[PDB]
Design a protein around this nucleic acid. Structure first.
Ligand SMILES: [Mg+2]
Ligand SMILES: [Mg+2]
Ligand SMILES: [Mg+2]
Ligand SMILES: [Mg+2]
Ligand SMILES: [Mg+2]
Ligand SMILES: [Mg+2]
Ligand SMILES: [Mg+2]
Ligand SMILES: [Mg+2]
Ligand SMILES: [Mg+2]
Ligand SMILES: [Mg+2]
Ligand SMILES: [Mg+2]
Ligand SMILES: [Mg+2]
Ligand SMILES: [Mg+2]
Ligand SMILES: [Mg+2]
Ligand SMILES: [Mg+2]
Ligand SMILES: [Mg+2]
Ligand SMILES: [Mg+2]
Ligand SMILES: [Mg+2]
Ligand SMILES: [Mg+2]
Ligand SMILES: [Mg+2]
Ligand SMILES: [Mg+2]
Ligand SMILES: [Mg+2]
Ligand SMILES: [Mg+2]
Ligand SMILES: [Mg+2]
Ligand SMILES: [Mg+2]
Ligand SMILES: [Mg+2]
Ligand SMILES: [Mg+2]
Ligand SMILES: [Mg+2]
Ligand SMILES: [Mg+2]
Ligand SMILES: [Mg+2]
Ligand SMILES: [Mg+2]
Ligand SMILES: [Mg+2]
Ligand SMILES: [Mg+2]
Ligand SMILES: [Mg+2]
Ligand SMILES: [Mg+2]
Ligand SMILES: [Mg+2]
Ligand SMILES: [Mg+2]
Ligand SMILES: [Mg+2]
Ligand SMILES: [Mg+2]
Ligand SMILES: [Mg+2]
Ligand SMILES: [Zn+2]
Lengths: 50, 158, 122, 134, 52, 59, 86, 135
RNA sequence: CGCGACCUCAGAUCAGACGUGGCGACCCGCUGAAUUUAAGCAUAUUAGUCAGCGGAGGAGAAGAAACUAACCAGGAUUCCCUCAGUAACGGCGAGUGAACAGGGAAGAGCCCAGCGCCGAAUCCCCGCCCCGCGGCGGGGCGCGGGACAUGUGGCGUACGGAA
RNA sequence: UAAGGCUAAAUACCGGCACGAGACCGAUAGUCAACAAGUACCGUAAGGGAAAGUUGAAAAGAACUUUGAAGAGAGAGUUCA
RNA sequence: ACCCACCCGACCCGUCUUGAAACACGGACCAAGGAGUCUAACACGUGCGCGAGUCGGGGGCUCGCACGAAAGCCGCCGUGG
RNA sequence: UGGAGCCGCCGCAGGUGCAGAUCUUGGUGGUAGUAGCAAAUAUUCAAACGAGAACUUUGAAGGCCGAAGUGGAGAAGGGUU
RNA sequence: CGACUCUUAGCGGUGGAUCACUCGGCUCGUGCGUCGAUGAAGAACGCAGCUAGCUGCGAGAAUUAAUGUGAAUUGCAGGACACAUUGAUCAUCGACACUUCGAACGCACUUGCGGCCCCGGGUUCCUCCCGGGGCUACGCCUGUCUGAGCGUCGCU
């Protein structure tokens, strides 16, 4: 909005940190079932806890 | 709809009864638990009868049962008074005492005095300390039995 | 290289602080070095220094709190920290002496009419 | 049979217990027999295998009478890597092939103090049981 | 449901009758052999032994 | 710098002065959309920033 | 107009993040939640939503105090002692 | 008494339940009195109450309360039963002399409902299909 | 126009304590439907059941007869088997529906007020010492405070009790 | 013998911690959920609520040569396959 | 039993219906899933045991149950039905 | 073909046999390379990059929005665009 | 023969039935039966050398101490350590620690405003200013201090 509270800004920050894709060294771990992050949120489609 | 002959019968399954069905898959597990707990209690009350205290003889009520005789709840005060056992003490030697029992007829009374007398004969009161004062029995009747009595103590047989 | 709990226990209070400071300094430089590449060889230390820092701080708090409960062991009113936490309800049980207070009437009863060890059939 | 009513004998329970076992417990699981030679000497059937014991592989492809030194113990993978027990990958690089500890025999132990005290404890219990049986 | 009538209760004499019937045919080599038991070389069929 | 989010400019100023034996003209904080309070710290003109920068490691 | 054109003017919000329960259900005008009833001293739970009941029972979260209490109890609520040292 | 809290009348339902005016609470006023004294002084543990008068509009009562954690109560053995945590909120559970009376329990033929612990418990006993193993 | 008792009331970030929310399978107190059945429906039934509110404990509640009975009488409470789909209720329709006895599981009984006697013989908190201190206790010593005669403590409570 | 009070035990336990078992289900079953599930996702909100197990004994997961911008191939190789 | 030919025969199933190839409804195709269950009470029939009796519950005695939460026994054998 | 368990007989037990339920979940056709990719006047030439240009970029021309703008800035909403 | 169409079979696709597995459920049982102002449950935000999710933890943040164990952890790095030494790694968990909301407590929910005591820079108690620390919810009980009343008395 460009007029944020601090509460909201911090919320957004964490959401922004969560988006990154898996580190590829994770795929090489021993008992690995994970191939892709599957919790990736694109701003244009799917619109936050808000 | 009824079809040709049968008891015009009323079942009581109109409330939500399946919400309150009470199964019995416990029961074996229960039966054991009681039994362990029973054997533990014996072992705790070491030479004392497993039974409990001694209990009076007593006739049932009503015309129906009338003829039979059970164990009652506890010996009346008159019965203790006549036997000559102080009521407060009688509890301490394993004699059941209720005090709410009347005593109408003298046939039921003298029988129940006789019971207590007999009990007091065949009772083995241990002394408080290993050093032996009055009342406490001989070390003969002590070594020869610190034995529990299995089953109800002096059982009533109609 | 290794900072152990072992040795720190005996050390003087001012000496423990200098050591913490000197680790806090060493942590800073590695954090600086993590930004500017640095080297894997440096970026190990950062974990090590962190835990040695904790090892120091821990020893200090253990020493401060041991001394503290020496100081109150005897006094009736003592800080909530130093009072023994068991479980809310368990800190409202009866006192351990208060729940074995017999009434004189009950004591007299136990004196006059004690349960006796007895057996039957002899 | 097993009569102790607190053990399990339940496939799912035993396997879950196994695969989700914690390192120190895996140490015990990853044990391996001594050579008849040592079996005679120490009075011990078997021992928890360790980083640099000397060892024969008894079964499989690498089954052989050579005595390779242990290389590492991958307790996550329930496996040990052994000196010349290896295989050339596509691009020439050697790769330490896993052998399960139980399909191996310890010819030479790596004796430290603690390993020494372990062997003293196991031998003593064995001889107590023989004395009880006699 | 749990309260399916799982357990099944049998008259006591009948239970005994069965147990007598089984005993009686633990004799009879034919009935023992037919039940599969290789009892070819056994010395006597109601096989009773010393009490050591 | 990156700074702890709870900090005042007063605290930062005091920290920067304490750690690097330095002295500050002014601190000028913001918050990154990421969460880490950044701090631009103008040093007083007796001091050169590139000189301290070389001291602390960065360049 | 009742539909698509009117979805156009959903410019402003009813609820925000409640600060007890965390849900985006704190109604700004009412200044209550409607999830935990925030200002309300006691938590909101209803016996009709058994699914809702389960979504934030105890187990659900960290149980950071409660999980070490269970351990403490197990071994016997011993306090202020150590194991025999080396 | 107790008028039925429903808007206007509008106890929508079968005209058995249409009543709103002439109907009467289960507990007594004296119990309500205790319950309120109990509510207010949470630490305090309601022992018992008595009556001190009545206007048309009000009744008056006097609820005896006790600190369970005052040493003079704690250390006196004959009272220290109230300091036990089963006796938290007696009045709320229907356990003072007053709130006992609504429960409808006494020995003898004039009761039977409440021939387990309480009213609810007897119903519970009487409406359990005991379903035995062997049947 | 004071000073002093008490009574009833305030205020303290006064000293020291407690209560608040949670969980809710089981438990205690309230509150309380309507689908439904009756081949319609209004009493009835569904049901003192769901939802609603309150309060607990490891269990809760109950409990030591203002009881049963009508016998040659039983003798607190709880639980099981039975009583019994019985006595009874009911548009006497649908439907609903206990108890005593009897046999078991268990088993344990007690305390006040009052009435009286006893120099309040009682209690709480201070402070100093010795022990003990991770369930704040013992013992001693203080003209150190207060509660209390508008009644604390010992004896005693119907099974009688006191002298 | 009412209008004051306390009391263990046999009794209850679809919540909790910790175990044991099964003539049960065997991935459209069995819990909504064998998996990063009360997750993703939807709804202003109360609330709603999925799908989804399996290379091989071992990764030995295809070096190298060649066609193509590449994805893709053709040979070669690994594997008992 | 695969295909083809020819002669004769031969309307599409399910269903409700007096009457369906119907201008009556359901049905594009394939896979997996998918509906007379369990408890209680009654009645009659049949099988077995005992028989003017019969009965087993409930309880108890015998075990840490591996198989047992079985099996066995009870002046409780009959309070009681 | 597959690669690790499975069946006959005598008894017992059941969540035991599908074509239909505008049945449930998953998959696949014919329809079909069909309908369709038509609101708001407009494109053209050369070059660059590049494997590759109707669509990128640069230059040149021709056009439109025509300051109640297809321009220049905010509010709310989005949340890194 | 030609194309197309239909049928059957071979092989290949599509699709994921079947079968075989099962660190999951479902049911029955046993024992125990423990949350919270000493701050619960729940929520938030943080914390890894490379880590997004799940988990684990709390600015001592994939954990500190202690005790038991006795060489690993391992996707890669890097390292440590002398694994003849309190000693890697797991387990236990009694010591220590435990950010912010939350019954939730200085008052407010902006993360805004405060008061009162002490400490360091600031002063040289000059109050300011900055930083740190400790207090500052409501209700209620036992006492304590200060009181109020043409409430009931006494003496003056
Ligand atoms: Mg959008
Ligand atoms: Mg008995
Ligand atoms: Mg007394
Ligand atoms: Mg009605
Ligand atoms: Mg009355
Ligand atoms: Mg509460
Ligand atoms: Mg009707
Ligand atoms: Mg009808
Ligand atoms: Mg109608
Ligand atoms: Mg009714
Ligand atoms: Mg309810
Ligand atoms: Mg109770
Ligand atoms: Mg009474
Ligand atoms: Mg009775
Ligand atoms: Mg009958
Ligand atoms: Mg009724
Ligand atoms: Mg008196
Ligand atoms: Mg009571
Ligand atoms: Mg699946
Ligand atoms: Mg599947
Ligand atoms: Mg499923
Ligand atoms: Mg499958
Ligand atoms: Mg597959
Ligand atoms: Mg499959
Ligand atoms: Mg194959
Ligand atoms: Mg019809
Ligand atoms: Mg017709
Ligand atoms: Mg037809
Ligand atoms: Mg026609
Ligand atoms: Mg039709
Ligand atoms: Mg159709
Ligand atoms: Mg099928
Ligand atoms: Mg018949
Ligand atoms: Mg296989
Ligand atoms: Mg089945
Ligand atoms: Mg089908
Ligand atoms: Mg076209
Ligand atoms: Mg712009
Ligand atoms: Mg073909
Ligand atoms: Mg599938
Ligand atoms: Zn909320």
């Amino acid at each position: 909005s460009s007029h944020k509270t601090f509460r909201i800004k911090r919320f957004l920050a964490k959401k922004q940190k969560q988006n990154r894709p898996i580190p590829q060294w994770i795929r090489m771990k021993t008992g690995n079932k994970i191939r892709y992050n599957s919790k990736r949120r694109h701003w244009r489609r799917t619109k936050l806890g808000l | 709809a009824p079809s040709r002959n049968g008891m015009i019968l009323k079942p009581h399954f109109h409330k939500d009864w399946q919400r309150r069905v009470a199964t019995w898959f416990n029961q074996p597990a229960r039966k054991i638990r009681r039994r362990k707990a029973r054997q533990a209690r014996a072992r705790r009350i070491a030479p004392r009868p497993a039974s409990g205290p001694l209990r009076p003889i007593v006739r049932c009520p009503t015309v129906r049962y009338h003829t039979k005789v059970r164990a009652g709840r506890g010996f009346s005060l008159e019965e203790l008074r006549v036997a000559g056992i102080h009521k407060k003490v009688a509890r301490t030697i394993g004699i059941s005492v209720d005090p709410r029992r009347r005593n109408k007829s003298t046939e039921s009374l003298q029988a129940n005095v006789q019971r207590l007398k007999e009990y007091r004969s065949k009772l083995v009161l241990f002394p408080r300390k290993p050093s032996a004062p009055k009342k406490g029995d001989s070390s003969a009747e002590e070594l020869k039995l610190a034995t529990q009595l299995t089953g109800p103590v002096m059982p009533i047989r109609n | 290289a290794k900072i152990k709990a072992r040795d720190l226990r005996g050390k003087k209070k001012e000496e423990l602080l200098k050591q913490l400071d000197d680790l806090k300094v060493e942590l800073s430089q590695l954090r600086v070095a993590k930004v500017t590449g640095g080297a894997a060889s440096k970026l190990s230390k950062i974990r090590v220094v962190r835990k040695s820092i904790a090892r120091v701080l821990t020893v200090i708090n253990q020493t401060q709190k041991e001394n503290l409960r020496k100081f109150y062991k005897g006094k009736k009113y003592k800080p909530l920290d130093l009072r023994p936490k068991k479980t809310r309800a368990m800190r409202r049980r009866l006192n351990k002496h208060e729940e074995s207070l017999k009434t004189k009437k009950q004591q007299r009863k136990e004196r006059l009419y004690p349960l006796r060890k007895y057996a039957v059939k002899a | 049979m097993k009569f102790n009513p607190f053990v399990t004998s339940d496939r799912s329970k035993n396997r879950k217990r196994h695969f989700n076992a914690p390192s120190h417990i895996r140490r015990k699981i990853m044990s391996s027999p001594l050579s008849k030679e040592l079996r005679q000497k120490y009075n011990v059937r078997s021992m928890p295998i360790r980083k640099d014991d000397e060892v024969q592989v008894v079964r499989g492809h690498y089954k052989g009478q050579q005595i390779g030194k242990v290389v590492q113990v991958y307790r996550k993978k329930y496996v040990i890597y052994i000196e010349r027990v290896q295989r050339e990958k596509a691009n020439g690089t050697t790769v330490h092939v896993g052998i399960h500890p139980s399909k191996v025999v310890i010819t030479r132990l790596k004796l430290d103090k603690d390993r020494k005290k372990i062997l003293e404890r196991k031998a003593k219990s064995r001889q107590v049981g023989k004395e009880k049986g006699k | 449901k749990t309260w399916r009538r799982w357990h099944r209760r049998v008259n006591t004499t009948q239970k005994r009758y069965a147990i007598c019937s089984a005993l009686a045919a633990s004799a009879l080599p034919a009935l023992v052999m037919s039940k599969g038991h290789r009892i070819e070389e056994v010395p006597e069929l109601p096989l009773v032994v010393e009490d050591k | 710098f990156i700074v702890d989010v709870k900090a005042n400019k007063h605290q930062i100023k005091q920290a920067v002065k304490k750690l690097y034996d330095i002295d500050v003209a002014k601190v000028n904080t913001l918050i990154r959309p990421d969460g880490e309070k950044k701090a631009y710290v103008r040093l007083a003109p007796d001091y050169d920033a590139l000189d301290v920068a070389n001291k602390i490691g960065i360049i | 107009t009742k539909g698509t054109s009117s979805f156009g003017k959903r410019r402003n919000k009813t609820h925000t993040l409640c600060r007890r329960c965390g849900s985006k259900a704190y109604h700004l005008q009412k200044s209550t939640c409607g999830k935990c009833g925030y200002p309300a001293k006691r938590k909101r739970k209803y016996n009709w939503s058994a699914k809702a009941k389960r979504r934030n029972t105890t187990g659900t979260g960290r149980m950071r105090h409660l999980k070490i209490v269970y351990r403490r109890f197990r071994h016997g609520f011993r306090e202020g002692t150590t194991p025999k040292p080396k | 008494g107790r008028k039925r809290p429903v808007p206007k009348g509008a106890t929508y339902g079968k005209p058995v339940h249409h009543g709103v005016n002439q109907l009467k609470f289960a507990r007594s006023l004296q119990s309500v009195a205790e319950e309120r004294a109990g509510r207010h002084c949470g630490a305090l543990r309601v022992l018992n109450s008595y009556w001190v008068g009545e206007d048309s509009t009000y009744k008056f009562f006097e609820v005896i309360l006790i600190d369970p954690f005052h040493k003079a109560i704690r250390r006196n053995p004959d009272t220290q039963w109230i300091t036990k945590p089963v006796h938290k909120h007696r009045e709320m559970r229907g356990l003072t002399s007053a709130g006992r009376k609504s429960r409808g329990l006494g020995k003898g033929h004039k009761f039977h409902h409440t021939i387990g612990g309480s009213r609810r418990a007897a119903w519970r006993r009487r409406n359990t299909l005991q379903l035995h193993r062997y049947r």
